Amino acid sequence: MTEYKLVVVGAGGVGKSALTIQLIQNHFVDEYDPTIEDSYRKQVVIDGETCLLDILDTAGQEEYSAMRDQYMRTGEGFLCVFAINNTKSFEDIHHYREQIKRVKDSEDVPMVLVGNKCDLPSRTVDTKQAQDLARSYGIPFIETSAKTRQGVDDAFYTLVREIRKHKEK
Numbered sequence: 347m348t349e350y351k352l353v354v355v356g357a358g359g360v361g362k363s364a365l366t367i368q369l370i371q372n373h374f375v376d377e378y379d380p381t382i383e384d385s386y387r388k389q390v391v392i393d394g395e396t397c398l399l400d401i402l403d404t405a406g407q408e409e410y411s412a413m414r415d416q417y418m419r420t421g422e423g424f425l426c427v428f429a430i431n432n433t434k435s436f437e438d439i440h441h442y443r444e445q446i447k448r449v450k451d452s453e454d455v456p457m458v459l460v461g462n463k464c465d466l467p468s469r470t471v472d473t474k475q476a477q478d479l480a481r482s483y484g485i486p487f488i489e490t491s492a493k494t495r496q497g498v499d500d501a502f503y504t505l506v507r508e509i510r511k512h513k514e515k
């Protein structure tokens with residue numbers, strides 16, 4: 347069993363805790379405080395390998411910058427989640443990519459672009475927009491929903507596989 351640290355990165359309100367809890371407790375949560383930051387452990391047999399995925403639902407602003415940079419350095423995978431009905435959080439993705447690349451001091455970082463709330467209207471972020479952005483970062487992009495659970499398992503599985511490829515590079 348290989349232990350893998352899967353951290354979710356995104357803006358406050360994209361559904362970090364929701365998507366995480368959905369796969370951990372197998373149920374959607376409508377009300378959950380965004381300040382709640384905790385990690386969850388889940389052993390999944392991916393490709394014949396039982397990997398222990400340690401998913402982290404971070405809050406945002408830490409008490410100390412060192413701790414911030416620390417959890418980012420030990421993080422193996424970074425799930426970039428945004429809202430398809432919000433351009434603000436979509437543009438915030440550039441900040442995360444830039445930051446993580448500096449914090450880990452590495453350009454090759456296993457990331458996966460995930461567009462949550464694909465079942466909701468007012469879609470401002472075009473699929474082509476996100477796809478092009480993902481291609482520019484050399485990472486995959488999957489539309490998901492914490493409600494319909496569409497492509498959720500796939501998005502997470504891909505993230506783990508991306509890490510693997512980076513490890514066996």
Ligand SMILES: Nc1nc2c(ncn2[C@@H]2O[C@H](COP(=O)(O)OP(=O)(O)O)[C@@H](O)[C@H]2O)c(=O)[nH]1
Nearest residue numbers: 358359360361362363364375376378380463492
């Ligand atoms: N409709 C809809 N609401 C979501 C979705 N994901 C999260 N939310 C809601 O966003 C609010 C905060 O969710 P939370 O788990 O705190 O996500 P976070 O604060 O971004 O980490 C709650 O009302 C969640 O139910 C989603 O995919 N669809």
Ligand SMILES: C[C@H](CN1c2ccccc2Sc2ccccc21)N(C)C
Nearest residue numbers: 351383384385402413416417420421
């Ligand atoms: C995010 C932390 C655990 N953690 C960590 C804690 C303090 C300093 C550095 C780190 S390394 C890290 C990396 C990935 C997931 C969680 C952490 N905990 C709130 C779950």
